[PDB]
Amino acid sequence: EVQLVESGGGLVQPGGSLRLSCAASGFTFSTYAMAWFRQAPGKEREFVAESWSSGTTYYGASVVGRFTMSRDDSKNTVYLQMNSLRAEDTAVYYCAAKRPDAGWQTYDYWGQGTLVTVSS
């Protein structure tokens, strides 16, 4: 079955940086959109970033200019580079995958997440 596996979570101080990665298999990676979402304690899941093999990449309003996402289609891996981290970036971060022929909010596959804590 499809696997999406996040790596890289942990504790970072405010102002620090952290890079997450997500390894994908079991579906046609090159044609899907890959995305990062996050869920802060007790809140609804929030869009973070999305990237297509065409190069098109875009971000949530709260993170644009601080986070960057990249994809390595040759290695079935995506990355989230998080800079200038803030306490309110604390969340479980999830990788997700979306078919090119699905509605723009329909994500078929979800990783199990990685915890990121930003605290002094």
Side-chain angles (χ1 to χ4, degrees), residues 73-90:
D73 277 82
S74 76
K75 301 194 182 168
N76 267 42
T77 301
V78 302
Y79 299 91
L80 186 70
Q81 177 60 234
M82 297 188 295
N83 305 129
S84 304
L85 278 162
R86 307 166 177 163
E88 64 263 26
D89 297 314
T90 294

Side-chain angles (χ1 to χ4, degrees), residues 1-4 24-29 32 76 109:
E1 296 196 307
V2 166
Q3 283 162 236
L4 290 178
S25 58
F27 62 100
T28 61
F29 183 90
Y32 281 51
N76 267 42
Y109 309 121

Side-chain angles (χ1 to χ4, degrees), residues 104-117:
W104 71 309
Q105 294 303 96
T106 299
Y107 292 80
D108 285 4
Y109 309 121
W110 290 86
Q112 289 160 353
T114 186
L115 178 63
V116 172
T117 303

Side-chain angles (χ1 to χ4, degrees), residues 6-97:
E6 300 88 347
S7 291
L11 170 69
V12 175
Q13 287 176 133
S17 295
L18 192 68
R19 192 181 68 185
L20 311 181
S21 66
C22 173
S25 58
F27 62 100
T28 61
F29 183 90
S30 58
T31 70
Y32 281 51
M34 293 299 300
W36 288 98
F37 286 80
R38 67 184 179 179
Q39 190 162 29
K43 302 302 172 183
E44 292 304 293
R45 196 136 61 178
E46 184 176 73
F47 177 81
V48 177
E50 180 153 277
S51 191
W52 300 83
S53 66
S54 68
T56 296
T57 303
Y58 41 80
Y59 301 95
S62 295
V63 306
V64 68
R66 292 189 301 127
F67 291 9
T68 61
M69 177 176 185
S70 58
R71 50 188 287 161
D72 187 340
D73 277 82
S74 76
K75 301 194 182 168
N76 267 42
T77 301
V78 302
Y79 299 91
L80 186 70
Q81 177 60 234
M82 297 188 295
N83 305 129
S84 304
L85 278 162
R86 307 166 177 163
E88 64 263 26
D89 297 314
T90 294
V92 181
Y93 283 73
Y94 296 91
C95 183

